[PDB]
């Protein structure tokens with residue numbers, strides 16, 4: 001949950017820097033700091049990874065007395081070949097390598113850990129570094145549609161690799177009298193990290209997709225409940241959201257879901273296509 005704030009705080013940093021510098025370079029220190037905090041790291045470095053999946057030897061940022069990086073170190077190479085976090089056998093001078101991998105499988109950067117306290121050298125920690133690293137990779141990377149598809153892929157990976165839930169709402173706006181105003185209300189209701197996408201379904205109707213990443217069934221209930229109150233303010237208490245021609249479809253992503261089940265929701269049920277949302 002501290003996760004929300006960190007990502008949100010980073011996203012803000014991204015949005016408020018000049019083009020006169022690539023994000024990874026400007027935010028190297030911040031990114032390392034985030035990772036250092038979540039893994040209670042003591043000695044580590046952050047490195048750019050090249051298109052050819054080899055790291056730039058010169059670190060973007062370091063923490064403590066980080067040694068020169070050995071690019072031929074098997075741990076680095078195994079991490080970079082697999083695109084996955086790798087750690088040394090706990091029974092047995094890097095201790096862990098964590099790649100920053102975006103949703104397309106491109107590796108942007110490498111966290112190399114020389115030392116972390118023995119007692120945070122476990123799967124729960126590794127999981128957290130890996131979750132955070134993937135999200136960070138995303139942020140470093142049609143605007144609205146591209147972003148929506150990326151975040152959606154991220155959520156699929158998070159549910160699949162880590163069992164983290166997410167929720168997808170589709171708001172079909174069937175009464176043109178209120179369509180624009182309903183959308184405006186939803187857009188103004190937006191939490192950072194949540195993403196929205198305006199579309200037209202195959203029946204020619206306006207649809208507003210809302211993706212709530214990292215959000216449990218209870219969270220999605222809290223959200224919708226917050227919305228009904230906003231709606232009651234905007235169109236009066238006497239009026240229900242549905243009486244404004246709004247139809248709700250909801251899809252919970254979780255460990256037991258699949259890309260195929262999600263596609264069925266987007267295309268078969270919501271009536272969208274893969275030119276609108278990439279799965």
Ligand SMILES: Nc1nc2c(ncn2[C@@H]2O[C@@H]3COP(=O)(O)O[C@H]4[C@@H](O)[C@H](n5cnc6c(=O)[nH]c(N)nc65)O[C@@H]4COP(=O)(O)O[C@H]3[C@H]2O)c(=O)[nH]1
Nearest residue numbers: 001002004005008009188189190191192193194222223226
């Ligand atoms: N009632 C409610 N409204 C929500 C919720 N999530 C988003 N919103 C609404 O969406 C706006 C933006 O949220 P944010 O982008 O995540 O950005 C937020 C967030 O960065 C931060 N913030 C405020 N309260 C909290 C909080 O209880 N926890 C965390 N982690 N951050 C908060 O302040 C920013 C703006 O806060 P707001 O001015 O209130 O403005 C909020 C609020 O109007 C929610 O769970 N409940």
Ligand SMILES: Nc1nc2c(ncn2[C@@H]2O[C@@H]3COP(=O)(O)O[C@H]4[C@@H](O)[C@H](n5cnc6c(=O)[nH]c(N)nc65)O[C@@H]4COP(=O)(O)O[C@H]3[C@H]2O)c(=O)[nH]1
Nearest residue numbers: 189190191194212213214215218219220221222223224226
């Ligand atoms: N993904 C997503 N989830 C949402 C949204 N709105 C509500 N939820 C979920 O519903 C729970 C309770 O919402 P809340 O009643 O507004 O109760 C909120 C609200 O009162 C307050 N809060 C958090 N963030 C903000 C904010 O940015 N602005 C304001 N005004 N209040 C916030 O803290 C309470 C708890 O926040 P949470 O622990 O995060 O728990 C939230 C959250 O899991 C949303 O726009 N997006």
Ligand code: NA
Nearest residue numbers: 172247249270
């Ligand atoms: Na519908």
Ligand code: NA
Nearest residue numbers: 267273274275
């Ligand atoms: Na299609």
